[PDB]
A paper describes a structure:
For instance, BRD4(2) did not interact with H3 peptides singly acetylated on K4. In contrast, this domain showed strong interaction with diacetylated H3 (H3K4acK9ac) but not with the same peptide acetylated at K4 but trimethylated at K9 (H3K4acK9me3). The second BET BRDs bound to tetra-acetyl H4 peptides with about 10-fold weaker affinities, suggesting that the first BRD in BET proteins recognizes the H4 tail.
The 61 BRDs in the human genome cluster into eight families based on structure/sequence similarity. Despite large sequence variations, all BRD modules share a conserved fold that comprises a left-handed bundle of four α helices (αZ, αA, αB, αC), linked by loop regions of variable length (ZA and BC loops), which line the Kac binding site and determine binding specificity. The four helices form a deep cavity that is extended by the two loop regions (ZA and BC loops), creating a largely hydrophobic Kac binding pocket.
Residue numbers in the entry: 349 to 459
Write the structure that this text describes.
């Protein structure tokens, strides 16, 4: 039940990682590299970084009590992107495309 919803979450994150979505999902695969040129202020702006690899690790370590906790982290990931980046930045458009995939699957999780 919660077990079933957590399995659904794993499939969702699996699809997010799939070749199908790779053209827009790739910036979200790994933590933001705060040592990269231009990101020297990232941690000043973003208090709680999150990325898909970290989410994968947390699912695998059974650190989400339920699908709502999983969803919170996925949304945190997107919101950090919307907060930090200029609203016309290509990465914001990419985030939206990936979020469309997530929201549609997450909505259709049986309950």
């Amino acid at each position: 039940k919660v077990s079933e919803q957590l399995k659904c979450c794993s499939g969702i994150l699996k699809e997010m990682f799939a070749k199908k979505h790779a053209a827009y999902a790739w910036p979200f695969y790994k933590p933001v590299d705060v040592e990269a040129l231009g990101l020297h202020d990232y941690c000043d702006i973003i208090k709680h970084p999150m990325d898909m690899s970290t989410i994968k690790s947390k699912l695998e370590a059974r650190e989400y009590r339920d699908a709502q906790e999983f969803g919170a982290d996925v949304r945190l990931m997107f919101s950090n992107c919307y907060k930090y980046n200029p609203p016309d930045h290509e990465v914001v458009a990419m985030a939206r495309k990936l979020q469309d995939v997530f929201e549609m699957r997450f909505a259709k999780m049986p309950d």
